[PDB]
Amino acid sequence: SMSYTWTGALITPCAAEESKLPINPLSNSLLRHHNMVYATTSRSASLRQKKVTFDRLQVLDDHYRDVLKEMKAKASTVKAKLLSIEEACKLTPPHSAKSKFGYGAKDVRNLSSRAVNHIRSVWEDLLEDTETPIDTTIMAKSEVFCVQPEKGGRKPARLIVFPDLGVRVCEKMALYDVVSTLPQAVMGSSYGFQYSPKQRVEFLVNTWKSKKCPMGFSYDTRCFDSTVTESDIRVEESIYQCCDLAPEARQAIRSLTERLYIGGPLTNSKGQNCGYRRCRASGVLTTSCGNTLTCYLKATAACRAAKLQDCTMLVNGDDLVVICESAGTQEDAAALRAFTEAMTRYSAPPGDPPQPEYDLELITSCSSNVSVAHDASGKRVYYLTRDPTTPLARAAWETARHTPINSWLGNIIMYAPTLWARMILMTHFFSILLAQEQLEKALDCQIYGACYSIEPLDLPQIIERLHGLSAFTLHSYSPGEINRVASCLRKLGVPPLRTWRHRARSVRAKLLSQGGRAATCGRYLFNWAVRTKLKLTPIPAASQLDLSGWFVAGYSGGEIYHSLS
Questions:
Q1: Binding residue per annotation — 444?
Q2: Distance (Å) of CA 541 to CA 227, 462, 546
Q3: 332 among the known binding-site residues?
Q4: How far apart, in whole angstroms, are the C-alpha atoms of residue 346 and residue 297?
Q5: Are residues 193 and 281 in the same domain?
Q6: Residues near 221 by Cβ (< 8 Å), separated by ≥ 6?
């Protein structure tokens, strides 16, 4: 069964695609090697198509089936509520794709008579048609990367697939509660999305220390979505069906599974037939939960085949980390081969093969690795961090162009404690914000496929809740970490880490100068940039935050918008 089949209709853009970074002043202040920062366009989509299109063989064994039965037994404890139309409408992001039926996302959120009526009619249809494949749009995704180690050697665009806005509101009705609460229920400590960065590094470390003589490894899969088989999607459904569901909810899931999730026609932006899909659609609500479930099922089966001892997993969609138990160096390298050849039977061959690590800090996952620093107390605090090449690169983009999602905002949130988000991302953007009278404005950002609307003035307490107060006091960062950031600041052409210190003093003074919530940003965020430190006490607004539904579930192209209605 082919992941995709094509007709020859192109993957068309719906608008004008920008490919290169503008030489903006605000841009160049951050990053001067602007010819290194590109964005993806539909021009590279056929390259991608060649990567994602293959025939997939799949052979399930007793291990797989044991594990599946164990997951279903736990999913049987779940009682999932059916959402009301209004409820699912509220969950729709305001700048989500308009419906081909002359109503939009802002219409849905407003309960526009028209939108609501043909959401209803779509729901009705899901109950009375169990067979007809639902149409989908296929699109080249525009993302900014920095170029790489070879020649100018760029990633092709990712392909997104999504049904109509109406179906997407329906998916939410039938399945939001299921995909929000079943992953934790089935996978427990291993479901990665339940974790704020603090909690995530805490789990990783505690898992590590709990071991004998720990061995760990990431496992990258080649184009995961393309490997998800029709079987995979049906089995996924068999798990959902173990929930207590409402009768309509149950037929809705059964219909969506047959009509949408397992495959269907792909249409371009010109309304032409592009071809057929028989694997995971990136942009349906089940994509994150289903990927996580499927990954954790396959991984856990492959462990037992590989005979790895006392494994623990952290699964985030298709990103898999495994901390387990060394049996000797050559033995370990041999079981890691087995895990792979077993994953390959399950139709999940590896990107570049898994490599046993023996330092926790060496293992990468979710584009991330644990690192160590010290708080003001000299006490060693663990934190999570990554190569800043991509974040800074996109930071360079959102500076020079208006973008719907400001990744930097999310990046300062998730990577509050990191050297590079503190010295560059915080400094850069706050000097901009201050020089533009735009601190009180709220900007949209994503955390785990979920959109929030946040005012940057509330960044210190959001950072304290998630990361701790030490994330304003960290120093003595590790050598290699420091050496990676600096090495990256060269590549991108970013002023080095001593440059950013002065700029910070300047804005920090400009921030204190304003009192109110502004000043507490300057005092807390940029306290690193002085030696006569102010001293830092718990912020009153910290505990009074509603950070519910923040680190509960992942919604990768699930179209979720948790912020205020």
A1: no
A2: 45, 9, 10
A3: no
A4: 10
A5: yes
A6: 227, 295, 318, 320, 343, 348, 349, 350, 351
Q: Measuring CA to CA, how many Å separate 158 from each of 117, 155, 389?
A: 33, 9, 19
Which H/E stretch holds residue 169? helix 165-187
Angle between helices 197-209 and 459-467 in degrees, nearest 10: 20
Final residue belonging to a domain, choices 367, 392, 426: 367
Assess whether 429 and 298 both reside in one domain.
Answer: no
Buried b (16+ CB within 10 A) or exposed e, 25-38: ebbbbbbebbebbb
On whether both 55 and 183 belong to a single domain, the answer is yes
Residue 500 tokens read as 């950013």
- What is the DSSP-derived secondary structure letter of residue 244? B
Reported resolution in A? Answer: 3.0
Let me know whether 372 and 352 are in one domain: no
**Distance separating alpha carbons of residues 493 and 147, to the nearest angstrom:** 13
Residues contacting residue 437 through CB under 8 Å, at least 6 positions apart: none
Method used to solve the structure:
X-ray
Tokens representing 44 are 């590279």
| Closest of 54, 41, 557, 10 to residue 275, by C-alpha | 10
Residue 476, by phi and psi: left (phi above 0), alpha (psi -120 to 50) or beta? left
Q: In this structure, are 267 and 120 located in the same domain?
A: yes
For residues 418 and 363, membership in a common domain is answered with no
- Total structural domains in the chain? 2
| Residue 318 marked in a binding site | yes
> Where does a domain end: 367, 382, 413?
367
Give burial (CB, 10 Å; 0-12/13-18/19+) of 260: buried
Radius of gyration of the CA atoms of the chain, in A:
24
Residue 218: which H helix or E strand, with range? strand 214-219
Range of the domain at 494: 368-565
